[PDB]
Amino acid sequence: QPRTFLLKYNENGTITDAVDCALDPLSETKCTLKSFTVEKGIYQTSNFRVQPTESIVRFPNITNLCPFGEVFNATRFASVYAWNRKRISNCVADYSVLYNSASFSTFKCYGVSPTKLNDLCFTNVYADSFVIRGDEVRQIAPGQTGNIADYNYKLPDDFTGCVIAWNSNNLDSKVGGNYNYLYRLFRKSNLKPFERDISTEIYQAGSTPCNGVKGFNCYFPLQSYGFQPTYGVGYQPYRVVVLSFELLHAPATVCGPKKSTNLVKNKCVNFNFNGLTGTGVLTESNKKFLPFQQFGRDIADTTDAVRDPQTLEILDITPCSFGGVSVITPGTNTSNQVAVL
Amino acid sequence: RDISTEIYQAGSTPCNGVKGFNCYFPLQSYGFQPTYGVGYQPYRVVVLSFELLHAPATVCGPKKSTNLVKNKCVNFNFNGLTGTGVLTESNKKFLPFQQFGRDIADTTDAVRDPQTLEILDITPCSFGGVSVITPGTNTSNQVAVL
Amino acid sequence: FNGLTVLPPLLTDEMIAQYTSALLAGTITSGWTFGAGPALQIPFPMQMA
Amino acid sequence: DIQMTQSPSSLSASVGDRVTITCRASQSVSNFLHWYQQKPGKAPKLLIYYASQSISGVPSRFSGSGSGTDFTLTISSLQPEDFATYYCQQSNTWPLTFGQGTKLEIK
Amino acid sequence: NQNAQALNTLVKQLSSNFGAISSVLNDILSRLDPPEAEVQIDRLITGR
Amino acid sequence: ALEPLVDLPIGINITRFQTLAAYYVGYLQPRTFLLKYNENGTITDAVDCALDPLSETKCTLKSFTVEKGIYQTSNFR
Amino acid sequence: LYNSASFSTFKCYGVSPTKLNDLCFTNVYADSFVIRGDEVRQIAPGQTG
Amino acid sequence: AYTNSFTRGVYYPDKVFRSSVLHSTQDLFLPFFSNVTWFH
Amino acid sequence: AYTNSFTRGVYYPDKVFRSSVLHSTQDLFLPFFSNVTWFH
Ligand SMILES: *[C@@H]1O[C@H](CO)[C@@H](O[C@@H]2O[C@H](CO)[C@@H](O[C@@H]3O[C@H](CO)[C@@H](O)[C@H](O)[C@@H]3O)[C@H](O)[C@H]2NC(C)=O)[C@H](O)[C@H]1NC(C)=O
Numbered sequence: 016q017p018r019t020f021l022l023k024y025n026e027n028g029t030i031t032d033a034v035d036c037a038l039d040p041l042s043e044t045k046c047t048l049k050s051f052t053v054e055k056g057i058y059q060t061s062n063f064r065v066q067p068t069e070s071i072v073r074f075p076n077i078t079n080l081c082p083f084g085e086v087f088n089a090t091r092f093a094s095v096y097a098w099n100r101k102r103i104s105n106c107v108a109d110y111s112v113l114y115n116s117a118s119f120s121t122f123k124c125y126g127v128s129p130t131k132l133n134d135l136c137f138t139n140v141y142a143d144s145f146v147i148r149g150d151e152v153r154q155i156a157p158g159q160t161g162n163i164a165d166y167n168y169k170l171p172d173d174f175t176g177c178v179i180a181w182n183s184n185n186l187d188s189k190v191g192g193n194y195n196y197l198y199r200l201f202r203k204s205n206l207k208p209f210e211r212d213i214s215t216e217i218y219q220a221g222s223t224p225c226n227g228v229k230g231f232n233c234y235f236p237l238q239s240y241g242f243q244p245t246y247g248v249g250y251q252p253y254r255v256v257v258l259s260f261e262l263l264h265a266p267a268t269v270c271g272p273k274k275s276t277n278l279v280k281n282k283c284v285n286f287n288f289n290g291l292t293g294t295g296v297l298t299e300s301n302k303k304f305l306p307f308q309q310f311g312r313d314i315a316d317t318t319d320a321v322r323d324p325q326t327l328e329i330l331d332i333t334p335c336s337f338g339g340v341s342v343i344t345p346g347t348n349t350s351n352q353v354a355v356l
Numbered sequence: 357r358d359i360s361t362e363i364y365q366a367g368s369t370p371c372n373g374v375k376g377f378n379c380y381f382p383l384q385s386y387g388f389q390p391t392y393g394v395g396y397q398p399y400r401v402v403v404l405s406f407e408l409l410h411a412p413a414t415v416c417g418p419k420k421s422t423n424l425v426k427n428k429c430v431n432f433n434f435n436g437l438t439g440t441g442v443l444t445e446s447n448k449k450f451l452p453f454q455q456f457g458r459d460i461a462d463t464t465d466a467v468r469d470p471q472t473l474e475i476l477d478i479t480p481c482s483f484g485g486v487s488v489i490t491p492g493t494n495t496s497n498q499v500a501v502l
Numbered sequence: 503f504n505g506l507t508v509l510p511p512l513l514t515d516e517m518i519a520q521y522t523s524a525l526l527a528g529t530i531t532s533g534w535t536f537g538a539g540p541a542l543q544i545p546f547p548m549q550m551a
Numbered sequence: 552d553i554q555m556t557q558s559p560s561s562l563s564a565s566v567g568d569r570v571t572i573t574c575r576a577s578q579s580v581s582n583f584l585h586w587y588q589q590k591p592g593k594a595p596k597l598l599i600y601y602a603s604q605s606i607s608g609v610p611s612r613f614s615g616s617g618s619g620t621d622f623t624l625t626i627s628s629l630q631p632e633d634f635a636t637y638y639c640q641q642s643n644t645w646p647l648t649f650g651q652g653t654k655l656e657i658k
Numbered sequence: 659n660q661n662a663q664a665l666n667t668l669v670k671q672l673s674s675n676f677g678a679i680s681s682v683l684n685d686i687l688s689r690l691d692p693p694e695a696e697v698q699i700d701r702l703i704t705g706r
Numbered sequence: 707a708l709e710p711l712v713d714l715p716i717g718i719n720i721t722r723f724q725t726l727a728a729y730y731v732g733y734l735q736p737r738t739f740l741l742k743y744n745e746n747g748t749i750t751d752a753v754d755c756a757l758d759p760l761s762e763t764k765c766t767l768k769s770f771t772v773e774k775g776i777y778q779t780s781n782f783r
Numbered sequence: 784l785y786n787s788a789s790f791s792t793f794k795c796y797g798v799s800p801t802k803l804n805d806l807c808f809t810n811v812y813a814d815s816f817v818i819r820g821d822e823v824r825q826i827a828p829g830q831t832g
Numbered sequence: 833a834y835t836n837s838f839t840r841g842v843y844y845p846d847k848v849f850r851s852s853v854l855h856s857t858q859d860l861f862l863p864f865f866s867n868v869t870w871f872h
Numbered sequence: 873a874y875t876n877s878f879t880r881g882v883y884y885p886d887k888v889f890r891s892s893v894l895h896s897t898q899d900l901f902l903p904f905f906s907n908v909t910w911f912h
């Protein structure tokens with residue numbers, strides 16, 4: 016076992032005798048005094064403290080849940096010519112319900128990791144929504160160029176966010192063709208990221224401008240997808256809800272969920288109250304908190320009491336009992352019996 | 357080394373043997389093509405982890421050896437152990453698993469030598485403060501030195 | 503507080519007073535002979551004389 | 552998930568009056584709501600679709616208006632043979648939720 | 659008064675940052691990597 | 707003693723303001739205050755540490771009653 | 784090893800690069816693997832990924 | 833017009849319960865007996 | 873069967889010489905007076 020010994024070497028250069036530091040308080044006194052012979056009196060060997068038996072985690076109750084049901088569970092997803100941007104803020108956003116369900120297959124969250132998402136505190140979430148073709152999964156990515164990247168909707172080069180999208184064939188495919196979903200082939204400008212071109216101007220290619228009519232080398236850019244259920248998986252409807260993130264501009268107001276833990280009283284616990292951590296014994300108090308105050312401090316900046324979240328109780332933080340370990344001994348001539356203070 | 361091929365479970369329900377619904381294979385491939393850029397290219401890493409003296413010293417360098425001198429103040433190099441002192445004969449009978457003897461507070465007391473296995477003692481060279489007995493510059497400039 | 507303990511004194515406050523009452527009774531009863539050897543009593547006008 | 556409510560529950564009406572029944576949504580269904588009518592022992596039928604427009608082939612004694620979370624129709628000329636339980640139906644989010652009902656009664 | 663004021667100063671110097679980002683050790687471990695949290699702890703150790 | 711009500715994480719820069727029959731407009735400065743807390747937790751009295759040297763003695767000694775004597779409270783430069 | 788110019792990332796913490804032959808090491812752990820191109824920073828004490 | 837501000841304008845600085853203690857804090861405060869400007 | 877270990881299990885820590893010095897080290901030692909398992 017990983018113990019600590021006290022070896023006595025000799026004039027030969029060999030070990031003669033030893034004690035174990037964790038066997039009894041007599042040999043603990045021999046360890047902390049570094050001799051086999053203790054004298055008669057009191058000696059402080061080590062420090063005793065009560066360990067935290069179990070931990071409790073506490074955080075304010077989630078009554079403001081973010082509108083992820085308004086951006087995932089919707090009948091009419093708007094198309095990519097009129098892609099709908101909603102600002103998700105002043106609530107608690109749950110990405111665990113997103114990650115733990117697998118209606119999608121193509122997470123690919125650039126920037127932040129897909130696993131550690133509910134712990135980081137973002138400030139501003141831009142929830143975009145558009146429907147594109149089934150084979151355009153590679154185009155919604157940082158760095159990749161093409162029709163959907165350049166002339167439809169561009170993701171930035173330093174894009175931090177998840178590219179959440181499911182390939183639905185039941186909802187957005189009509190037998191004969193859903194001609195409501197629309198995209199652009201011809202456009203005379205590569206689009207900068209987070210830009211929305213809803214204008215319906217006539218594209219001129221070859222020589223002579225048409226300017227209001229359609230004909231030779233004058234193509235209307237607004238063209239239909241025409242989704243059919245007999246198509247392959249590259250031509251199926253592909254419902255995209257991309258989530259843009261912070262970009263260091265705001266204070267934090269949208270955060271991940273925090274699982275609360277039921278509290279136990281009159282025991283040494285390792286608590287967490289609203290970001291304030293510590294170890295102590297929680298008990299009831301008769302100190303009248305004013306209703307805006309969350310934690311109370313004593314003389315010289317030590318947290319004496321904290322106001323309990325989710326029930327508005329006032330709990331007194333008592334530190335766990337500690338003290339030095341004193342060993343009463345008569346000396347190694349007299350006896351090996353000890354008393355522990 | 358994590359050589360095991362157990363599939364990773366992410367979302368809810370453990371598949372336990374079938375790659376599929378919330379069940380991704382952990383071992384995904386590089387797939388190197390020479391048309392890739394330098395940030396996508398292979399990189400043959402050969403890392404040389406040392407420890408600095410968990411053991412007796414075995415991996416030395418190509419520096420040439422030097423003949424030994426007795427009872428003089430020298431700057432020795434005993435398999436990477438650099439120190440100063442005189443090298444005298446010792447009567448400390450070591451057991452044959454020791455390579456060096458160690459004094460109080462991380463100072464080396466006795467070292468057995470390479471290529472000979474003859475035991476040596478390290479005593480530090482003679483030091484001490486200097487002191488001046490003077491009667492004062494007003495009386496005389498004659499100086500006793502202690 | 504954290505890391506701070508106050509050790510109690512070996513002589514308590516009711517029992518330092520027993521030493522002071524013993525010194526007062528010895529002084530008033532015997533002059534200074536209890537500080538030298540055995541306590542030899544004396545009347546207190548003779549002591550103050 | 553839309554808690555779809557309507558007030559009042561049971562209101563009476565007389566011959567040829569102007570009645571107004573409202574129906575409220577918890578979340579924004581801003582321009583997608585449908586109005587139905589259901590006699591006892593009879594399947595319903597559309598009255599007002601998308602909260603403004605009307606179907607061809609209905610008697611136009613009524614019209615519908617409203618946006619946001621406040622929706623209504625006004626029957627400008629009531630007749631005693633209706634006496635039916637009126638239903639709202641939004642069209643914004645899954646699952647699709649009806650209302651409890653405003654049953655009209657004659658005095 | 660001198661003993662209680664020396665103890666009150668001894669408790670009150672736990673709130674000093676000593677040039678670090680925060681004075682709470684669990685707070686500067688909870689959002690930082692180990693080998694910069696090492697030099698963030700070590701300033702508090704030498705100051706206290 | 708004025709209790710807080712709200713805390714809004716807006717994060718927008720504010721420089722000038724305008725109000726929608728008589729009112730007082732005061733300005734705040736970064737000065738140190740000594741706050742006396744009651745047993746219920748409310749503020750009973752307060753001392754501005756930059757008003758006069760008697761209040762400098764009060765903020766130096768951290769008490770509202772100073773005894774008779776001389777106190778070195780600040781440094782003239 | 785030092786005079787070979789085929790490498791570009793010698794990059795040695797712990798013992799300094801220029802004085803390396805003079806110490807006598809005890810155990811040398813010559814590990815070897817092949818990685819993705821921009822993962823040079825993650826083989827370093829502290830940088831994680 | 834101008835008015836002396838007397839002793840008004842003191843708020844709770846840190847939302848911490850404190851009892852029977854003299855606390856010194858350094859935030860933005862209205863100074864005592866300063867000129868507060870009166871409008872109509 | 874089980875036997876008391878008494879005061880056995882003591883070895884040299886780190887292959888290093890030390891003489892007439894009370895030395896404290898923390899290695900994987902056999903604890904004193906523990907139970908060892910006896911097979912016959
Ligand atoms: C968007 O819609 C989906 C589908 O409705 C929501 O996912 C969850 O789906 C399951 C089954 O499809 C449902 O869970 C239900 O939970 C109750 C209470 O535990 C149980 O009694 C039922 O038998 C059923 O299992 C439910 O539709 C839903 N779960 C919830 C809402 O807790 C999804 O949550 C919706 N929102 C988002 C942001 O994706």
Ligand SMILES: *[C@@H]1O[C@H](CO)[C@@H](O)[C@H](O)[C@H]1NC(C)=O
Nearest residue numbers: 025026027028029447448449
């Ligand atoms: C070896 O051990 C014996 C036994 O106590 C001791 O007397 C002697 O001094 C040691 N040294 C030598 C060199 O024999």
Ligand SMILES: *[C@@H]1O[C@H](CO)[C@@H](O)[C@H](O)[C@H]1NC(C)=O
Nearest residue numbers: 051052053054346347348349
């Ligand atoms: C016990 O006492 C004797 C003298 O009374 C002394 O010589 C001896 O060293 C003591 N034993 C110890 C300290 O182990």
Ligand SMILES: *[C@@H]1O[C@H](CO)[C@@H](O)[C@H](O)[C@H]1NC(C)=O
Nearest residue numbers: 490491492493494495496497
């Ligand atoms: C030097 O010593 C003499 C006699 O000891 C004395 O008279 C003289 O004043 C001394 N010089 C000085 C500078 O004190």
Ligand SMILES: *[C@@H]1O[C@H](CO)[C@@H](O)[C@H](O)[C@H]1NC(C)=O
Nearest residue numbers: 303743744745746747748750
């Ligand atoms: C504290 O509050 C209680 C109840 O509000 C009151 O009775 C008591 O007088 C207060 N103490 C003061 C103001 O010192």
